[PDB]
Ligand binder design. Structure first.
Ligand SMILES: Cc1cc2nc3c(=O)[nH]c(=O)nc-3n(C[C@H](O)[C@H](O)[C@H](O)COP(=O)(O)OP(=O)(O)OC[C@H]3O[C@@H](n4cnc5c(N)ncnc54)[C@H](O)[C@@H]3O)c2cc1C
Ligand SMILES: NC(=O)c1ccc[n+]([C@@H]2O[C@H](COP(=O)([O-])OP(=O)(O)OC[C@H]3O[C@@H](n4cnc5c(N)ncnc54)[C@H](OP(=O)(O)O)[C@@H]3O)[C@@H](O)[C@H]2O)c1
Length: 308
């Protein structure tokens, strides 16, 4: 008698792709050092700000999956001569990545530039270090991190993705695995619906890639853009993400009542409110309380949010 089945730790059940998940392999103390392969500005010279797409080599050392983030420790020192603390960035590439070899990672970064009360033009430290990165230079990477935005296991589920600005990042990740990759254990056949809010047309992130996916899966891939400073509803209200969602109110509420519908939200902290406003009315007309229903969805792993 050399064996025994040690009693099992009690565990919560999950509908998301978390099997063999990895978080925090690399710490800021000793980050994984990768190199920049490419770094391109994806917004028009005319857009209010600049957003860049960049790819780093990982030689397969960073075991990330769709929906996770990695931290970046930007080169340099702060005002007190100390190294910079990490900044987190949602991964914009699928687990196998932009080279299809599982040896790279991609980011979608907005260059942060503003002016303080003193009237001084301030440049965000990490975002400017990243957007300035030249191919061939090293970059310190930490993580992976996160389990909230992991894709659902069900390959026939309805996945509603709501994002603003660079919040599109994890959705580009999900969608690559869903429509640009042939997976033995996962071949998506449900309905993927993406809503993306950006300020101008010169700011439409990954527009061409999304259009190729629609041209390849015209049935099960739906795409709706909400250009806030160019588009307007019938009353002249700015077309924010919730204003566009409102044109499909009947349909979305109908999908939300389905049990295989998963909603993901990523981007600005504020997008959260206008959407709940839209949802509270729908449930109300249906004799439902969104406050209680949302609670249920959240616990059922069907209302996933990652905003900052
Ligand atoms: C999980 C997670 C994922 C993220 N994913 C992404 C992503 O994919 N892409 C992305 O670009 N960002 C993402 N971010 C944000 C990112 O981590 C950084 O905060 C961002 O890049 C800015 O950092 P920085 O080092 O450039 O700026 P910092 O040097 O840290 O400066 C930021 C500070 O400047 C001030 N500030 C910022 N904006 C303004 C303003 N408009 N007016 C006045 N003061 C201001 C604030 O005090 C703020 O604390 C994510 C954040 C989290 C938590
Ligand atoms: N995992 C994460 O937590 C994660 C991942 C990626 C990005 N982010 C965060 O999300 C943000 C992305 O910012 P960005 O600079 O890329 O975006 P932005 O370009 O400044 O604007 C995004 C769009 O959303 C609109 N908007 C503003 N307030 C809104 C509101 N309350 N409800 C709905 N829409 C609203 C804006 O309209 P107007 O400009 O006309 O006002 C704009 O069209 C960053 O702050 C980043 O930190 C977080």
């Amino acid at each position: 008698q050399v064996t025994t089945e040690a009693p099992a730790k009690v565990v919560k059940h999950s509908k998301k792709q978390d099997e063999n998940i990895v978080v925090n392999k690399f710490k800021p103390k000793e980050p994984y050092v990768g190199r920049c392969l490419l770094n391109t500005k994806i917004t028009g010279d005319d857009a209010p700000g600049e957003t860049w797409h960049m790819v780093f080599s990982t030689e397969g050392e960073v075991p990330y999956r769709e929906g996770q983030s990695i931290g970046i420790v930007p080169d340099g020192i702060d005002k007190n001569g100390k190294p910079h603390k990490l900044r987190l960035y949602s991964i914009a590439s699928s687990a196998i990545g932009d080279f299809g070899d599982s040896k790279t990672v991609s980011l979608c970064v907005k260059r942060l530039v503003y002016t303080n009360d003193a009237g001084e033009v301030v440049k965000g430290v990490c975002s400017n270090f990243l957007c300035d990165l030249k191919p061939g230079s090293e970059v310190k990477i930490t993580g992976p991190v996160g389990k909230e935005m992991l894709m659902p296991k069900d390959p026939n589920a309805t996945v509603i993705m709501l994002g603003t600005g660079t919040g599109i990042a994890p959705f580009r990740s999900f969608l690559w695995k869903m429509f640009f990759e042939k997976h033995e254990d996962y071949q998506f056949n449900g309905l993927a619906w993406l809503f993306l809010g950006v300020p101008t047309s010169s700011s439409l992130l990954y527009k061409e890639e999304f259009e190729k996916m629609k041209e390849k899966a015209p049935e099960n891939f739906r795409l709706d853009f909400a250009v806030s400073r160019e588009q307007v509803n019938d009353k002249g209200e700015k077309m924010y993400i919730q204003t566009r969602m409102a044109q499909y109110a009947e349909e979305l509420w109908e999908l939300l009542k389905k049990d295989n519908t998963f909603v993901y939200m990523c981007g600005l902290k504020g997008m959260e409110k206008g959407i709940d406003d839209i949802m509270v009315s729908l449930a109300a007309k249906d004799g439902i309380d969104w406050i209680e229903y949302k609670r249920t969805l959240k616990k059922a792993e069907q209302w996933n949010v990652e905003v900052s």
